Amino acid sequence: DIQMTQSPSSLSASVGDRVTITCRASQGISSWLAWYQQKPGKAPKLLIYDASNLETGVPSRFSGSGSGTDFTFTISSLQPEDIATYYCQQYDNLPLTFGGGTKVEI
Amino acid sequence: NITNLCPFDEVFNATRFASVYAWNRKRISNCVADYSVLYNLAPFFTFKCYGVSPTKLNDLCFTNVYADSFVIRGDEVRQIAPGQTGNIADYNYKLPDDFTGCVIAWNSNKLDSKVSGNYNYLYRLFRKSNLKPFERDISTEIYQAGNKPCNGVAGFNCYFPLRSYSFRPTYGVGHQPYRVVVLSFELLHAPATVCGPKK
Amino acid sequence: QVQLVQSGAEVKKPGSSVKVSCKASGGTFSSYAISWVRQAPGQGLEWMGRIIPIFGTANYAQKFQGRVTITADESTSTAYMELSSLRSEDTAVYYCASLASYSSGWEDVFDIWGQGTMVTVS
Protein backbone atom coordinates (compact mmCIF):
# COMPACT_ATOMS: atom_id res chain seq x y z
CA ASP A 1 0.00 0.00 0.00
CA ILE A 2 1.01 3.62 -0.53
CA GLN A 3 3.34 4.70 2.28
CA MET A 4 4.36 8.20 3.37
CA THR A 5 7.64 9.24 4.97
CA GLN A 6 7.38 12.33 7.17
CA SER A 7 10.51 14.15 8.32
CA PRO A 8 11.89 15.49 10.58
CA SER A 9 10.58 13.14 13.29
CA SER A 10 10.98 15.97 15.82
CA LEU A 11 11.79 19.67 15.44
CA SER A 12 12.56 22.16 18.22
CA ALA A 13 12.21 25.90 17.72
CA SER A 14 11.64 29.10 19.66
CA VAL A 15 8.79 31.61 19.81
CA GLY A 16 8.28 33.30 16.46
CA ASP A 17 10.52 30.82 14.65
CA ARG A 18 9.31 29.53 11.31
CA VAL A 19 8.64 25.78 11.17
CA THR A 20 8.85 23.58 8.06
CA ILE A 21 7.66 19.96 7.96
CA THR A 22 8.24 17.73 4.93
CA CYS A 23 5.95 14.87 3.91
CA ARG A 24 6.96 12.61 1.02
CA ALA A 25 4.70 10.05 -0.65
CA SER A 26 6.18 6.86 -2.08
CA GLN A 27 3.79 7.28 -5.04
CA GLY A 28 2.58 10.41 -6.80
CA ILE A 29 -0.66 11.86 -5.41
CA SER A 30 -2.67 14.56 -7.18
CA SER A 31 -2.61 17.08 -4.30
CA TRP A 32 -4.87 14.80 -2.20
CA LEU A 33 -3.09 15.48 1.10
CA ALA A 34 -4.25 16.80 4.47
CA TRP A 35 -2.49 17.92 7.65
CA TYR A 36 -3.64 17.44 11.24
CA GLN A 37 -2.71 18.93 14.61
CA GLN A 38 -2.85 16.71 17.70
CA LYS A 39 -2.37 18.19 21.15
CA PRO A 40 -1.16 15.78 23.86
CA GLY A 41 -3.98 13.56 25.07
CA LYS A 42 -6.47 15.07 22.62
CA ALA A 43 -8.00 14.12 19.29
CA PRO A 44 -6.29 15.35 16.10
CA LYS A 45 -7.53 18.65 14.67
CA LEU A 46 -7.90 19.08 10.91
CA LEU A 47 -5.78 22.14 10.06
CA ILE A 48 -5.32 21.83 6.28
CA TYR A 49 -7.80 19.71 4.31
CA ASP A 50 -6.23 20.08 0.84
CA ALA A 51 -2.72 20.62 -0.49
CA SER A 52 -3.05 24.31 0.43
CA ASN A 53 -6.65 24.84 1.63
CA LEU A 54 -7.05 26.00 5.22
CA GLU A 55 -10.14 24.84 7.10
CA THR A 56 -12.62 27.37 8.47
CA GLY A 57 -11.46 28.83 11.77
CA VAL A 58 -7.85 27.64 11.40
CA PRO A 59 -5.43 30.58 11.78
CA SER A 60 -3.68 31.77 8.64
CA ARG A 61 -0.52 31.31 10.73
CA PHE A 62 -0.46 27.81 9.21
CA SER A 63 0.22 27.11 5.54
CA GLY A 64 1.00 24.25 3.19
CA SER A 65 1.72 23.41 -0.42
CA GLY A 66 3.02 20.65 -2.65
CA SER A 67 2.14 18.22 -5.40
CA GLY A 68 3.13 14.80 -6.66
CA THR A 69 5.28 13.07 -4.07
CA ASP A 70 6.75 15.99 -2.08
CA PHE A 71 4.60 18.18 0.17
CA THR A 72 5.48 20.76 2.81
CA PHE A 73 3.56 22.26 5.73
CA THR A 74 4.85 25.39 7.44
CA ILE A 75 4.09 27.60 10.44
CA SER A 76 4.85 31.27 9.84
CA SER A 77 5.51 31.77 13.57
CA LEU A 78 5.62 29.57 16.68
CA GLN A 79 3.06 30.69 19.25
CA PRO A 80 2.89 28.71 22.52
CA GLU A 81 -0.43 27.22 21.36
CA ASP A 82 1.27 25.76 18.25
CA ILE A 83 3.45 23.29 20.19
CA ALA A 84 1.93 19.98 19.06
CA THR A 85 2.43 16.92 16.86
CA TYR A 86 1.47 17.20 13.19
CA TYR A 87 0.63 14.33 10.82
CA CYS A 88 0.29 14.29 7.05
CA GLN A 89 -2.54 12.15 5.68
CA GLN A 90 -2.78 10.87 2.12
CA TYR A 91 -6.26 10.20 0.74
CA ASP A 92 -5.63 9.84 -3.01
CA ASN A 93 -6.52 6.13 -2.76
CA LEU A 94 -8.75 4.17 -0.39
CA PRO A 95 -6.04 2.81 1.98
CA LEU A 96 -5.53 6.08 3.83
CA THR A 97 -2.00 6.32 5.24
CA PHE A 98 -0.86 8.78 7.89
CA GLY A 99 2.66 10.13 8.11
CA GLY A 100 5.12 9.28 10.85
CA GLY A 101 4.30 12.56 12.60
CA THR A 102 6.48 15.48 13.68
CA LYS A 103 6.75 16.35 17.38
CA VAL A 104 7.23 20.10 17.90
CA GLU A 105 9.08 21.31 21.00
CA ILE A 106 9.62 24.82 22.34
CA ASN B 1 -11.40 49.14 -21.96
CA ILE B 2 -10.19 46.55 -19.44
CA THR B 3 -6.82 44.92 -18.79
CA ASN B 4 -7.24 42.22 -16.12
CA LEU B 5 -7.52 38.67 -17.44
CA CYS B 6 -10.53 36.58 -16.46
CA PRO B 7 -10.15 34.03 -13.63
CA PHE B 8 -10.42 30.97 -15.89
CA ASP B 9 -7.37 29.46 -14.18
CA GLU B 10 -9.18 28.94 -10.86
CA VAL B 11 -12.20 27.37 -12.61
CA PHE B 12 -10.59 24.78 -14.90
CA ASN B 13 -7.40 23.95 -12.97
CA ALA B 14 -9.12 23.84 -9.57
CA THR B 15 -8.26 20.65 -7.69
CA ARG B 16 -11.76 20.45 -6.19
CA PHE B 17 -14.89 20.15 -8.32
CA ALA B 18 -18.43 20.24 -7.00
CA SER B 19 -20.90 17.39 -7.34
CA VAL B 20 -23.59 17.45 -10.00
CA TYR B 21 -25.84 17.53 -6.93
CA ALA B 22 -25.48 21.13 -5.70
CA TRP B 23 -23.23 22.18 -8.56
CA ASN B 24 -21.03 25.26 -8.25
CA ARG B 25 -21.61 28.55 -10.07
CA LYS B 26 -18.91 31.21 -10.54
CA ARG B 27 -19.68 34.67 -11.90
CA ILE B 28 -17.19 36.28 -14.29
CA SER B 29 -17.26 40.01 -15.00
CA ASN B 30 -14.99 42.96 -15.76
CA CYS B 31 -12.13 40.99 -17.28
CA VAL B 32 -10.46 40.10 -20.57
CA ALA B 33 -11.57 36.63 -21.68
CA ASP B 34 -8.85 34.94 -23.73
CA TYR B 35 -10.17 31.48 -24.64
CA SER B 36 -7.05 30.35 -26.53
CA VAL B 37 -5.53 28.98 -23.31
CA LEU B 38 -8.48 26.58 -22.94
CA TYR B 39 -8.80 24.64 -26.19
CA ASN B 40 -5.08 24.87 -27.03
CA LEU B 41 -4.09 22.55 -24.17
CA ALA B 42 -4.17 18.76 -24.29
CA PRO B 43 -6.31 17.74 -21.27
CA PHE B 44 -9.54 19.33 -22.58
CA PHE B 45 -10.78 16.49 -24.77
CA THR B 46 -14.24 17.80 -25.70
CA PHE B 47 -15.34 21.40 -26.27
CA LYS B 48 -18.64 22.35 -27.91
CA CYS B 49 -20.51 25.65 -28.23
CA TYR B 50 -24.13 26.64 -28.84
CA GLY B 51 -25.04 29.93 -30.49
CA VAL B 52 -21.34 30.73 -31.03
CA SER B 53 -18.20 29.03 -32.30
CA PRO B 54 -14.92 28.27 -30.47
CA THR B 55 -12.86 30.40 -32.86
CA LYS B 56 -15.24 33.37 -32.55
CA LEU B 57 -15.11 33.42 -28.74
CA ASN B 58 -11.99 35.60 -28.63
CA ASP B 59 -13.64 38.20 -30.91
CA LEU B 60 -16.92 38.66 -29.01
CA CYS B 61 -18.10 40.71 -26.03
CA PHE B 62 -20.35 39.38 -23.28
CA THR B 63 -22.53 41.26 -20.79
CA ASN B 64 -22.44 38.47 -18.19
CA VAL B 65 -20.61 35.15 -17.94
CA TYR B 66 -21.29 32.22 -15.60
CA ALA B 67 -19.04 29.18 -15.13
CA ASP B 68 -20.80 26.07 -13.82
CA SER B 69 -18.67 23.09 -12.82
CA PHE B 70 -19.45 19.51 -11.79
CA VAL B 71 -18.39 15.89 -12.31
CA ILE B 72 -20.40 13.27 -14.21
CA ARG B 73 -19.89 9.86 -15.78
CA GLY B 74 -18.54 9.70 -19.31
CA ASP B 75 -21.80 8.40 -20.78
CA GLU B 76 -23.67 11.26 -19.08
CA VAL B 77 -21.73 14.02 -20.87
CA ARG B 78 -24.26 13.60 -23.69
CA GLN B 79 -27.00 14.73 -21.29
CA ILE B 80 -25.25 18.11 -20.90
CA ALA B 81 -26.86 19.92 -23.84
CA PRO B 82 -30.04 21.88 -24.63
CA GLY B 83 -33.28 19.93 -24.79
CA GLN B 84 -31.77 16.67 -23.53
CA THR B 85 -33.35 14.13 -21.20
CA GLY B 86 -32.05 11.90 -18.43
CA ASN B 87 -31.24 11.87 -14.74
CA ILE B 88 -28.61 14.62 -14.92
CA ALA B 89 -30.75 16.78 -17.21
CA ASP B 90 -34.06 16.15 -15.45
CA TYR B 91 -33.10 16.25 -11.77
CA ASN B 92 -29.58 17.70 -11.40
CA TYR B 93 -28.62 20.19 -14.14
CA LYS B 94 -30.83 21.33 -17.03
CA LEU B 95 -29.83 23.78 -19.76
CA PRO B 96 -32.34 26.18 -21.35
CA ASP B 97 -33.65 25.65 -24.86
CA ASP B 98 -32.07 28.94 -26.01
CA PHE B 99 -28.81 28.21 -24.18
CA THR B 100 -25.96 30.42 -25.41
CA GLY B 101 -22.58 29.16 -24.26
CA CYS B 102 -20.11 26.30 -24.40
CA VAL B 103 -19.63 23.00 -22.58
CA ILE B 104 -16.11 21.79 -21.76
CA ALA B 105 -15.71 18.23 -20.51
CA TRP B 106 -12.67 15.99 -20.16
CA ASN B 107 -11.71 12.74 -18.46
CA SER B 108 -10.50 13.03 -14.86
CA ASN B 109 -10.21 9.35 -13.94
CA LYS B 110 -6.69 9.81 -12.58
CA LEU B 111 -7.92 12.46 -10.11
CA ASP B 112 -11.49 11.52 -9.19
CA SER B 113 -11.20 7.71 -8.95
CA LYS B 114 -10.15 5.41 -6.11
CA VAL B 115 -10.05 1.64 -5.82
CA SER B 116 -13.46 0.85 -4.32
CA GLY B 117 -14.14 4.44 -3.33
CA ASN B 118 -14.65 7.89 -4.85
CA TYR B 119 -17.81 8.66 -2.88
CA ASN B 120 -16.95 12.37 -3.23
CA TYR B 121 -19.49 12.85 -6.03
CA LEU B 122 -23.24 12.31 -5.77
CA TYR B 123 -26.25 12.81 -8.03
CA ARG B 124 -30.00 13.02 -7.49
CA LEU B 125 -31.99 10.02 -8.72
CA PHE B 126 -35.52 10.76 -7.43
CA ARG B 127 -37.50 13.98 -7.81
CA LYS B 128 -41.17 14.88 -8.06
CA SER B 129 -40.70 17.17 -11.07
CA ASN B 130 -37.97 18.05 -13.55
CA LEU B 131 -35.75 21.02 -12.77
CA LYS B 132 -36.18 24.38 -14.46
CA PRO B 133 -33.22 25.66 -16.50
CA PHE B 134 -30.20 26.32 -14.27
CA GLU B 135 -32.22 25.11 -11.27
CA ARG B 136 -30.44 24.01 -8.09
CA ASP B 137 -31.65 21.59 -5.41
CA ILE B 138 -29.64 21.03 -2.22
CA SER B 139 -32.40 19.25 -0.29
CA THR B 140 -32.18 15.56 0.60
CA GLU B 141 -35.64 14.79 2.00
CA ILE B 142 -36.89 11.21 1.73
CA TYR B 143 -39.15 10.42 -1.24
CA GLN B 144 -42.30 9.31 0.55
CA ALA B 145 -44.51 6.87 -1.36
CA GLY B 146 -47.84 8.48 -0.44
CA ASN B 147 -49.87 5.55 0.91
CA LYS B 148 -48.06 6.04 4.25
CA PRO B 149 -45.84 8.89 5.48
CA CYS B 150 -42.08 8.55 5.74
CA ASN B 151 -39.43 9.71 8.19
CA GLY B 152 -36.54 7.62 6.84
CA VAL B 153 -35.67 5.41 3.91
CA ALA B 154 -38.22 2.59 3.74
CA GLY B 155 -39.71 0.11 1.30
CA PHE B 156 -41.41 0.55 -2.05
CA ASN B 157 -41.04 4.19 -3.14
CA CYS B 158 -39.60 5.53 0.15
CA TYR B 159 -36.12 5.93 -1.31
CA PHE B 160 -33.20 8.11 -0.31
CA PRO B 161 -33.01 10.67 -3.14
CA LEU B 162 -29.24 10.82 -3.69
CA ARG B 163 -26.68 8.27 -4.86
CA SER B 164 -22.93 8.19 -5.49
CA TYR B 165 -21.08 7.16 -8.64
CA SER B 166 -18.31 5.42 -6.66
CA PHE B 167 -15.67 5.86 -9.35
CA ARG B 168 -12.92 3.25 -9.48
CA PRO B 169 -10.12 2.62 -11.99
CA THR B 170 -11.68 -0.74 -12.91
CA TYR B 171 -14.57 1.11 -14.60
CA GLY B 172 -14.58 1.53 -18.36
CA VAL B 173 -14.26 4.83 -20.18
CA GLY B 174 -18.03 5.29 -20.25
CA HIS B 175 -18.41 5.09 -16.46
CA GLN B 176 -15.19 6.94 -15.62
CA PRO B 177 -15.52 10.41 -14.05
CA TYR B 178 -15.53 13.36 -16.45
CA ARG B 179 -14.70 16.88 -15.26
CA VAL B 180 -17.17 19.32 -16.82
CA VAL B 181 -17.22 23.12 -17.03
CA VAL B 182 -20.16 24.98 -18.59
CA LEU B 183 -19.83 28.60 -19.72
CA SER B 184 -22.98 30.70 -20.20
CA PHE B 185 -22.97 33.95 -22.17
CA GLU B 186 -25.18 36.99 -22.72
CA LEU B 187 -24.89 38.98 -25.94
CA LEU B 188 -26.80 42.22 -25.34
CA HIS B 189 -25.48 45.70 -26.13
CA ALA B 190 -23.61 48.02 -23.78
CA PRO B 191 -22.78 47.84 -20.92
CA ALA B 192 -20.52 44.80 -21.50
CA THR B 193 -18.18 43.49 -18.82
CA VAL B 194 -16.35 40.68 -20.68
CA CYS B 195 -14.54 41.14 -24.00
CA GLY B 196 -11.82 39.36 -25.91
CA PRO B 197 -8.19 40.52 -26.23
CA LYS B 198 -8.92 42.72 -29.25
CA LYS B 199 -7.42 46.12 -30.01
CA GLN C 1 -23.24 21.75 13.92
CA VAL C 2 -22.09 18.14 14.30
CA GLN C 3 -20.82 16.34 17.39
CA LEU C 4 -19.63 12.77 17.92
CA VAL C 5 -19.86 11.13 21.36
CA GLN C 6 -18.08 7.83 22.00
CA SER C 7 -18.77 5.16 24.59
CA GLY C 8 -16.66 4.37 27.63
CA ALA C 9 -13.23 2.79 27.77
CA GLU C 10 -12.68 -0.97 27.73
CA VAL C 11 -10.14 -3.35 29.28
CA LYS C 12 -10.02 -7.01 28.21
CA LYS C 13 -7.91 -10.14 28.25
CA PRO C 14 -6.62 -11.39 24.87
CA GLY C 15 -8.94 -13.28 22.56
CA SER C 16 -12.07 -11.26 23.40
CA SER C 17 -13.87 -8.67 21.26
CA VAL C 18 -14.79 -4.99 21.59
CA LYS C 19 -18.13 -3.37 20.75
CA VAL C 20 -17.42 0.37 21.01
CA SER C 21 -19.90 2.88 19.59
CA CYS C 22 -20.13 6.58 18.77
CA LYS C 23 -23.51 8.32 18.80
CA ALA C 24 -24.11 11.06 16.24
CA SER C 25 -25.70 14.25 17.58
CA GLY C 26 -27.15 17.28 15.85
CA GLY C 27 -28.29 17.48 12.24
CA THR C 28 -29.60 14.24 10.77
CA PHE C 29 -28.08 10.78 10.41
CA SER C 30 -28.67 10.96 6.65
CA SER C 31 -25.63 13.25 6.32
CA TYR C 32 -22.82 11.50 8.26
CA ALA C 33 -20.21 8.94 7.24
CA ILE C 34 -18.00 7.42 9.94
CA SER C 35 -14.42 6.15 9.92
CA TRP C 36 -12.38 4.57 12.71
CA VAL C 37 -8.74 5.50 13.36
CA ARG C 38 -6.33 3.55 15.57
CA GLN C 39 -3.46 5.10 17.54
CA ALA C 40 -1.13 2.81 19.46
CA PRO C 41 0.45 4.31 22.61
CA GLY C 42 2.93 6.93 21.46
CA GLN C 43 2.71 5.99 17.76
CA GLY C 44 1.08 7.46 14.69
CA LEU C 45 -2.54 7.30 13.62
CA GLU C 46 -3.72 4.33 11.54
CA TRP C 47 -6.89 4.17 9.46
CA MET C 48 -8.96 1.00 9.92
CA GLY C 49 -12.08 1.29 7.77
CA ARG C 50 -14.96 3.37 6.50
CA ILE C 51 -18.74 3.01 6.82
CA ILE C 52 -21.46 4.82 4.86
CA PRO C 53 -24.71 3.58 6.47
CA ILE C 54 -27.04 5.21 3.94
CA PHE C 55 -25.49 3.34 1.00
CA GLY C 56 -24.79 0.26 3.13
CA THR C 57 -21.13 0.08 2.08
CA ALA C 58 -18.14 -0.53 4.34
CA ASN C 59 -14.40 -0.83 3.75
CA TYR C 60 -11.48 -2.07 5.86
CA ALA C 61 -7.71 -1.94 5.68
CA GLN C 62 -5.79 -4.98 4.47
CA LYS C 63 -4.52 -5.83 7.96
CA PHE C 64 -8.01 -5.69 9.49
CA GLN C 65 -9.83 -7.24 6.51
CA GLY C 66 -11.66 -10.25 7.91
CA ARG C 67 -11.03 -9.12 11.50
CA VAL C 68 -12.82 -5.75 11.94
CA THR C 69 -16.51 -5.20 11.20
CA ILE C 70 -18.17 -1.77 11.11
CA THR C 71 -21.95 -1.37 11.31
CA ALA C 72 -24.54 1.30 12.06
CA ASP C 73 -28.07 1.57 13.46
CA GLU C 74 -30.36 4.30 12.12
CA SER C 75 -32.90 3.86 14.93
CA THR C 76 -30.31 5.01 17.49
CA SER C 77 -27.75 6.62 15.13
CA THR C 78 -24.96 4.59 16.77
CA ALA C 79 -22.00 3.71 14.56
CA TYR C 80 -20.67 0.29 15.57
CA MET C 81 -17.24 -1.23 15.02
CA GLU C 82 -16.03 -4.60 16.29
CA LEU C 83 -12.55 -6.12 16.52
CA SER C 84 -12.15 -9.88 16.87
CA SER C 85 -9.42 -12.12 18.31
CA LEU C 86 -7.83 -9.47 20.52
CA ARG C 87 -4.07 -9.64 21.01
CA SER C 88 -1.70 -7.47 23.01
CA GLU C 89 -0.61 -5.33 20.05
CA ASP C 90 -4.27 -4.41 19.46
CA THR C 91 -4.01 -2.01 22.41
CA ALA C 92 -4.62 1.54 21.19
CA VAL C 93 -6.88 4.57 21.52
CA TYR C 94 -9.69 4.35 18.97
CA TYR C 95 -11.32 7.50 17.58
CA CYS C 96 -14.67 7.85 15.83
CA ALA C 97 -14.53 10.51 13.13
CA SER C 98 -16.85 11.87 10.44
CA LEU C 99 -15.76 11.94 6.80
CA ALA C 100 -16.19 14.93 4.52
CA SER C 101 -16.15 12.74 1.40
CA TYR C 102 -19.83 11.82 1.76
CA SER C 103 -20.97 15.27 0.64
CA SER C 104 -20.89 17.62 -2.34
CA GLY C 105 -17.36 17.57 -3.75
CA TRP C 106 -15.49 17.02 -0.47
CA GLU C 107 -12.94 14.30 0.38
CA ASP C 108 -12.13 11.69 3.04
CA VAL C 109 -10.48 14.21 5.39
CA PHE C 110 -11.90 13.80 8.90
CA ASP C 111 -13.57 16.99 10.12
CA ILE C 112 -15.04 16.08 13.53
CA TRP C 113 -13.36 13.60 15.87
CA GLY C 114 -14.86 11.81 18.84
CA GLN C 115 -13.51 11.91 22.37
CA GLY C 116 -11.85 8.53 21.77
CA THR C 117 -12.03 5.31 23.78
CA MET C 118 -9.15 3.75 25.70
CA VAL C 119 -8.81 0.07 24.81
CA THR C 120 -6.03 -1.99 26.40
CA VAL C 121 -5.24 -5.69 26.70
CA SER C 122 -4.12 -6.81 30.16
Residue numbers in the entry:
A (entry chain V): 268 to 373
B (entry chain C): 331 to 529
C (entry chain U): 1 to 122
Which text from the study accompanies this structure?
pmcThe Omicron variant of SARS-CoV-2, the causative virus of COVID-19, was initially reported from South Africa in November 2021, and quickly became the dominant strain worldwide. Compared to the original wildtype (WT) strain of SARS-CoV-2, Omicron has 60 amino acid mutations, of which 37 mutations are in the spike protein, the target of most COVID-19 vaccines and therapeutic antibodies. 15 mutations are in the RBD, which contains the ACE2 binding site as well as the epitopes for 90% of antibodies induced by infection or vaccination. We report the structures of the Omicron spike trimer on its own or in complex with ACE2 or an anti-Omicron antibody.
